[PDB]
Design an enzyme around this catalytic site. Sequence first.
Site, mmCIF file in Angstrom:
data_model
loop_
_atom_site.group_PDB
_atom_site.id
_atom_site.type_symbol
_atom_site.label_atom_id
_atom_site.label_comp_id
_atom_site.label_asym_id
_atom_site.label_seq_id
_atom_site.Cartn_x
_atom_site.Cartn_y
_atom_site.Cartn_z
ATOM 1 N N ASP A 193 0.807 -1.213 0.000
ATOM 2 C CA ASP A 193 0.000 0.000 0.000
ATOM 3 C C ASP A 193 0.854 1.283 0.000
ATOM 4 O OD1 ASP A 193 -1.898 1.996 0.357
ATOM 5 O OD2 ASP A 193 -2.953 0.943 1.979
ATOM 6 N N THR A 194 1.195 1.765 -1.188
ATOM 7 C CA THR A 194 2.076 2.925 -1.298
ATOM 8 C C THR A 194 1.385 4.211 -0.802
ATOM 9 O OG1 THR A 194 1.504 3.276 -3.635
ATOM 10 C CG2 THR A 194 3.424 1.890 -3.179
ATOM 11 N N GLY A 195 0.050 4.223 -0.769
ATOM 12 C CA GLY A 195 -0.691 5.368 -0.207
ATOM 13 C C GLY A 195 -0.836 5.386 1.316
HETATM 14 C C1 MUT Z 1 -12.444 1.276 -3.909
HETATM 15 O O1 MUT Z 1 -11.334 2.177 -3.964
HETATM 16 C C2 MUT Z 1 -10.700 2.640 -2.840
HETATM 17 C C3 MUT Z 1 -9.630 3.523 -2.985
HETATM 18 C C4 MUT Z 1 -8.931 3.989 -1.860
HETATM 19 C C5 MUT Z 1 -9.298 3.601 -0.569
HETATM 20 S S1 MUT Z 1 -8.453 4.078 0.738
HETATM 21 O O2 MUT Z 1 -7.976 5.429 0.595
HETATM 22 O O3 MUT Z 1 -9.308 3.977 1.904
HETATM 23 N N1 MUT Z 1 -7.173 3.131 1.023
HETATM 24 C C6 MUT Z 1 -7.495 1.680 0.993
HETATM 25 C C7 MUT Z 1 -6.611 0.923 1.986
HETATM 26 C C8 MUT Z 1 -6.744 1.446 3.415
HETATM 27 C C9 MUT Z 1 -6.899 -0.573 1.976
HETATM 28 C C10 MUT Z 1 -5.961 3.498 0.268
HETATM 29 C C11 MUT Z 1 -4.815 3.816 1.240
HETATM 30 O O4 MUT Z 1 -3.583 3.872 0.498
HETATM 31 C C12 MUT Z 1 -5.134 5.124 1.991
HETATM 32 C C13 MUT Z 1 -5.011 6.388 1.121
HETATM 33 C C14 MUT Z 1 -5.230 7.633 1.974
HETATM 34 C C15 MUT Z 1 -6.509 7.986 2.380
HETATM 35 C C16 MUT Z 1 -6.705 9.113 3.181
HETATM 36 C C17 MUT Z 1 -5.636 9.902 3.583
HETATM 37 C C18 MUT Z 1 -4.350 9.544 3.187
HETATM 38 C C19 MUT Z 1 -4.157 8.429 2.386
HETATM 39 N N2 MUT Z 1 -4.212 5.385 3.110
HETATM 40 C C20 MUT Z 1 -4.638 5.381 4.377
HETATM 41 O O5 MUT Z 1 -5.765 5.031 4.688
HETATM 42 C C21 MUT Z 1 -3.704 5.836 5.469
HETATM 43 C C22 MUT Z 1 -4.255 7.159 6.059
HETATM 44 N N3 MUT Z 1 -3.069 8.011 6.076
HETATM 45 C C23 MUT Z 1 -3.040 9.281 6.718
HETATM 46 C C24 MUT Z 1 -1.856 9.832 7.213
HETATM 47 C C25 MUT Z 1 -1.835 11.090 7.824
HETATM 48 C C26 MUT Z 1 -3.005 11.820 7.965
HETATM 49 C C27 MUT Z 1 -4.202 11.285 7.486
HETATM 50 C C28 MUT Z 1 -5.510 12.071 7.622
HETATM 51 C C29 MUT Z 1 -5.495 13.421 8.273
HETATM 52 O O6 MUT Z 1 -6.546 11.590 7.183
HETATM 53 C C30 MUT Z 1 -4.213 10.032 6.876
HETATM 54 C C31 MUT Z 1 -2.040 7.435 5.445
HETATM 55 O O7 MUT Z 1 -0.899 7.831 5.275
HETATM 56 O O8 MUT Z 1 -2.394 6.113 4.974
HETATM 57 C C32 MUT Z 1 -10.354 2.687 -0.444
HETATM 58 C C33 MUT Z 1 -11.071 2.226 -1.549
#
Ligand code: MUT
EC number: 3.4.23.16
Lengths: 99, 99
Positions: free
Chosen positions: A25-27
């Site tokens: 999960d690069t995000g």
């Molecule tokens: C059907 O298609 C979809 C696309 C994307 C998602 S996702 O974003 O929930 N997520 C899925 C994963 C959790 C299995 C993608 C992750 O890479 C997600 C992307 C992201 C969302 C919101 C904010 C940042 C990044 N990453 C994360 O959930 C965590 C959250 N996060 C983070 C860090 C710092 C501050 C925050 C805030 C303030 O929300 C979030 C972070 O670095 O990674 C769900 C479904």
Amino acid sequence: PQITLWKRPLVTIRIGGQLKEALLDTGADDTVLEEMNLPGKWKPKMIGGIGGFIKVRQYDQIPIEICGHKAIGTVLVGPTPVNIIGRNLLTQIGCTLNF
Amino acid sequence: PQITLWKRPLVTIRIGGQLKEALLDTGADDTVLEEMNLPGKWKPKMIGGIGGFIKVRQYDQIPIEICGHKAIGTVLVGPTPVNIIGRNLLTQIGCTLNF
Ligand SMILES: COc1ccc(S(=O)(=O)N(CC(C)C)C[C@@H](O)[C@H](Cc2ccccc2)NC(=O)[C@@H]2CN(c3cccc(C(C)=O)c3)C(=O)O2)cc1
């Protein structure tokens, strides 16, 4: 390996002698795993995601072998929808994006 | 190019003369963009992540330029903190994971 993205990049990890599947999960800044027992001291933490914020337990210096590659670092445990490997460990195993 | 994961994998995208920064996100099935009023038909959808679910609007066949690479496909628009380039488009620009 090289991994294409027509399918979810799911790999097998080994942690505490247990095998699980987790999503590369690069995000994700941080590696977050579903509820499980790990030994040693943890600290309460809260983290954000797309749907809001959750409480997790933070374990430091945990060994995980990710698709054959050794990491040792921070693992957050809590109500993530799926086991995710984030950048904190992806960097350890030498993982890059390429196009 | 090769993108290391020491920092968030943000890149510039273009969608109809809006330039935005977005995460190349291998953990995202679909592309999710911050709130914006795109022309054309859409359908409501719920997507889940950390913290739970958000309601999004699904637009089909939307051209997006990502780092000068051309893509066109489904984009989900809703109340996300970050623009997320998901696997549906990462494949089109030739992005893989490597370690
Ligand atoms: C059907 O298609 C979809 C696309 C994307 C998602 S996702 O974003 O929930 N997520 C899925 C994963 C959790 C299995 C993608 C992750 O890479 C997600 C992307 C992201 C969302 C919101 C904010 C940042 C990044 N990453 C994360 O959930 C965590 C959250 N996060 C983070 C860090 C710092 C501050 C925050 C805030 C303030 O929300 C979030 C972070 O670095 O990674 C769900 C479904």
